[model samples]
Target: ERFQLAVSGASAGLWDWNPKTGAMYLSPHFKKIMGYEDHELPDEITESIHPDDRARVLAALKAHLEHRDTYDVEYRVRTRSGDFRWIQSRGQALWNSAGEPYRMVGWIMDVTDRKRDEDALRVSREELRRL
Candidate 1:
């Protein structure tokens, strides 16, 4: 399938979800990036998101599927090693003639280092101001 080719050899994690059939795919490398083996990772989405981010992520997903807005969001995922990592996900949904969504595909990339840099700079500036 073309989807297989799209996911292969890519540095980012790839996901394809078929809502009508409840089938989902996550690339092997995607699982590995999160410190998970293929078997260790569950197929469900959103559960891995940090509690603080779950609601916001869900809201974004809803906006995309319901209103055809872009499904682009950044959130923290709980890695298998128990640390939280920042990732940005972007997906687009396919709709039938009746306007029913059937499939969605997306990619996830780790942005923890970028987020860390931003946080450090913010803290650094705040400390300088207090001096």
Candidate 2:
């Protein structure tokens, strides 16, 4: 499937959740992408997410579920190696004929370097603005 290829080829992670049943599926590479052994991923992968990012990620997901907005955020993910790396996650909700959300799908990709550069540039711009 195109979705599968996108996740795998980019060395990214994929996750899907059924809103009604609360069932979730995660790609095998999810742990690998985050620098973890496949077998070491926690049963509740969410526990490994960076603490600072947890609230924002949860709020974004909740907003998506409530149909208030889509899920699109970039934050740090805590790797099994104990390093926090930047990642960008985004996806849309599937809707039924009545416009109710049926499922949520998303992908996460490591973007540590990109994020670092972005932040550096932002700081430089801010400093310039203050001059």
Candidate 3:
């Protein structure tokens, strides 16, 4: 089917989470991007986030869950090889009739290459300014 084909071609990782039950489902591509097998990683999304970025990521998620903002964020995640990679994630929550957000689904794409180039440009710009 088209859906299966779409997922097969998708480089980004897809994730579904149940906030109330703390259950998470991660797509195979998601684990692959992190150099992990499906059985290697936990169901917790934040477990892979870089320590320095964890609080900010959590804050952003909280804001989204409370309906104050959209859940679109870029942050660093630790890879299986112990390297950090930048990822851009976006998600939407499903609210129940009682106005409680019970479920969220999201996709994350690796953006490390772009982040590296941006950092290089920043350094060059600063050096030029100093010249």
Candidate 4:
């Protein structure tokens, strides 16, 4: 299957969710990205999301389910060691006949270095503006 092949490619971490069931599934690679083992499953991983970005992520998810907007966001996810790293998450939702999103699947990756470089560039541009 495509998911199986992709899962083995090792280029990203996979995840799935069911809004109706309020269930969340984080793949081994997804957890490993943040240095967690495959067997690890928190009671509710929602709390693992960075506090600053949680609101935005939730809002975007709501929009995607309600209005069919693109489901893509970059936010920090807490690692097993209790540190945060910027992660890019993108997924598609499958709507039932009633047009409600029941299932969503996606992948996430650690984008900490890219985000750091972008922040540095932004600061450099800000300095230039003040010069």
Clashing pairs in 4: none
lDDT of 4: 0.86
Weakest 10 consecutive residues of candidate 1 by summed lDDT: 2-11
What is the RMSD of candidate 1? 3.0
* TM-score-superior candidate, 2 or 3: 3
Residue 18 error for model 3, in Å? 0.6
Residue 41 accuracy (lDDT) in model 4: 59
Candidate 2 matches the true fold with a TM-score of: 0.75
Model 1: per-residue lDDT, tens digit, 1-131?
A: 67666656556888888867867788777887787987887755445799999999999988988899999999999999889999988899999999889999988888889999999999999999999
Q: What's the true lDDT of residue 126 in model 4?
A: 100
Q: Evaluate all candidate structures by whole-model CA lDDT and list the values in order.
A: 0.85, 0.80, 0.86, 0.86
As a TM-score, model 3 comes out at: 0.85
- Model 2 per-residue lDDT tens digits across residues 55-121: 9999998888776597889888778678899989888789788877788888888899998899999
Which stretch of 10 consecutive residues in model 2 shows the poorest summed lDDT? 38-47
TM-score of 4: 0.86
lDDT of 3 by residue, 12-60 (tens): 8888989888787888888877879888977565477999999999999
Q: What stretches of model 4 exceed 4 Å from their correct place? A: 2-4, 7-10, 42-46
- Candidate 1 regions exceeding 4 Å error are 1-10, 20-22, 39-46
